[PDB]
Amino acid sequence: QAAADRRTVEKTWKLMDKVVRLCQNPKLQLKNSPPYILDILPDTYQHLRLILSKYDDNQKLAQLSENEYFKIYIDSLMKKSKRAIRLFKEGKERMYEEQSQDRRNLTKLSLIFSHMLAEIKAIFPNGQFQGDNFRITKADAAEFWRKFFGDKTIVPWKVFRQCLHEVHQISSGLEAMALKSTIDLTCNDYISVFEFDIFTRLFQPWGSILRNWNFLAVTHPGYMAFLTYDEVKARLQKYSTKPGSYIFRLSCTRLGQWAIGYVTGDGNILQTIPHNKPLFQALIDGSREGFYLYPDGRSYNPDL
Ligand SMILES: COc1cc([N+](=O)[O-])cc([C@H]2N(C(=O)COc3ccc4ccc(OC)c(CC(=O)O)c4n3)[C@@H](C)c3cccc(=O)n32)c1C
Ligand SMILES: [Mg+2]
């Protein structure tokens, strides 16, 4: 990780600007729906401009430029922005085909950028680095983080995996690789305390977290990962005549929280946020009551 001096941070601004120009192409017919690069990248430049404003003398810039998280962040942003630029160049006319693999990769990158924005606003609230004070929401998860990493804001994946394995054993590399793609929202091969917080909130309780993660995100056909409210309604339309069809999903706008969509006996699509109980438990309760019967339309619910 190169040092994050103002020259480097500015070089990243120019790259993001290219991505914004490329995404303004009308032939693209880009829909205003989260994650929306034309919101995320400008807001990211703004937050970076804020951070740099605070580190105004030369002993502050030495702090910021040497900040391990910030060094990693700026390097990711530059790599992801170069990737996006490469995507349009190599994708050429295939970028206007709203269903092409080139546009799907652009959507993948827009999620990442969105996750990176939420992270930096969390780690640098109001441009001031607060990474070592970040309060992990689940207490037993926070015990784990402080025990093995203490004050750190960001941790190499390999380090994180070995320490997690001491407490919750991973069965295989394929599992570890699926776990990585789940926890590592920003796809930078690191685990920040923000990503850890999102993960242990989604798949609580900590004491059985890997079982919960497998049950919800690996083996459950009802899991849909990131969808907007409208996208949930759209996907369930084909099942509006099959009450009990349901899916559950995440929101890139409100990380760390689950939502469920399901079809009522009348053929209506309702969506609900399970406040104050783990998702696997809401699904188990929901199944018994007769609401959550056919995950994504299949004919049986996965075995608890
Ligand atoms: C039971 O009533 C609801 C259930 C859901 N619903 O299940 O989607 C959504 C809505 C409500 N909205 C919100 O409440 C937004 O505030 C939150 C707060 C926490 C959230 C946690 C997770 C989550 O999903 C991962 C969402 C929804 C999202 O981010 O998309 C959250 N939204 C937004 C979206 C919206 C858009 C269009 C119609 C609509 O009614 N609403 C209501 C009342
Ligand atoms: Mg990461």
Swiss-Prot record:
Q: Which residues bind 4-O-phospho-L-tyrosine?
A: R249
Binding site residues for Ca(2+): D184, T186, N188, Y190, E195
Q: Which domain of life is it from?
A: Eukaryota
Keyword set for this entry?
Answer: Calcium, Cytoplasm, Disease variant, Metal-binding, Phosphoprotein, Repeat, Transferase, Ubl conjugation, Ubl conjugation pathway, Zinc, Zinc-finger
Question: May I have one GO cellular component term?
Answer: glutamatergic synapse
For the keyword Calcium, the answer is: yes
Q: How does the record describe the protein's post-translational processing? A: Phosphorylated on tyrosine and serine residues upon TCR or BCR activation, and upon various types of cell stimulation.
One of the record's GO molecular function terms:
ubiquitin protein ligase activity
Compartments, as annotated in UniProt: Cytoplasm
Q: In which tissues is it expressed?
A: Expressed in placenta, heart, lung, kidney, spleen, ovary and testis, as well as fetal brain and liver and hematopoietic cell lines, but not in adult brain, liver, pancreas, salivary gland, or skeletal muscle. Present in lymphocytes (at protein level).
Query: Which residue ranges are recorded for the region named 4H?
Result: 1-130
User: Could you tell me which residues carry Phosphoserine?
Assistant: S245
Q: Which GO terms describe its biological process?
A: CD4-positive, alpha-beta T cell proliferation; immune response; intracellular signal transduction; negative regulation of CD4-positive, alpha-beta T cell proliferation; negative regulation of epidermal growth factor receptor signaling pathway; negative regulation of T cell receptor signaling pathway; NLS-bearing protein import into nucleus; positive regulation of protein catabolic process
Main location, first listed in the record: cytoplasm
SH2-like as annotated region, ranges = 204-304
What sequence ranges are listed for the domain Cbl-PTB? 1-304
What upregulates it?
By serum starvation.
What does the record give as the function of this protein? Answer: E3 ubiquitin-protein ligase which accepts ubiquitin from specific E2 ubiquitin-conjugating enzymes, and transfers it to substrates, generally promoting their degradation by the proteasome. Negatively regulates TCR (T-cell receptor), BCR (B-cell receptor) and FCER1 (high affinity immunoglobulin epsilon receptor) signal transduction pathways. In naive T-cells, inhibits VAV1 activation upon TCR engagement and imposes a requirement for CD28 costimulation for proliferation and IL-2 production.
Quote the subunit structure annotation. Interacts with SH3 domain-containing proteins LCK, CRK and SORBS1. Interacts with LCP2 and ZAP70. Interacts with CBL. Interacts with SH3 domain-containing proteins VAV1, FYN, FGR, PLCG1, GRB2, CRKL, PIK3R1 and SH3KBP1/CIN85. Identified in heterotrimeric complexes with SH3KBP1/CIN85, CD2AP and ARHGEF7, where one CBLB peptide binds two copies of the other protein. Interacts with poly-ubiquitinated proteins. Dimerization is required for the binding of poly-ubiquitin, but not for the binding of mono-ubiquitin. Interacts with EGFR (phosphorylated). Interacts with IFT20.
Domain commentary: The N-terminus is composed of the phosphotyrosine binding (PTB) domain, a short linker region and the RING-type zinc finger. The PTB domain, which is also called TKB (tyrosine kinase binding) domain, is composed of three different subdomains: a four-helix bundle (4H), a calcium-binding EF hand and a divergent SH2 domain.
Task: Tell me more from the record.
Answer: This protein has one functional calcium-binding site.
The linked condition is:
Autoimmune disease, multisystem, infantile-onset, 3: An autosomal recessive disorder characterized by autoimmune manifestations apparent in the first months or years of life. Clinical features may include hypothyroidism, type 1 diabetes mellitus, systemic inflammatory manifestations such as fever and hepatomegaly, and autoimmune cytopenias.
Q: What is this protein called?
A: E3 ubiquitin-protein ligase CBL-B
Say which species the protein is native to: Homo sapiens (Human)
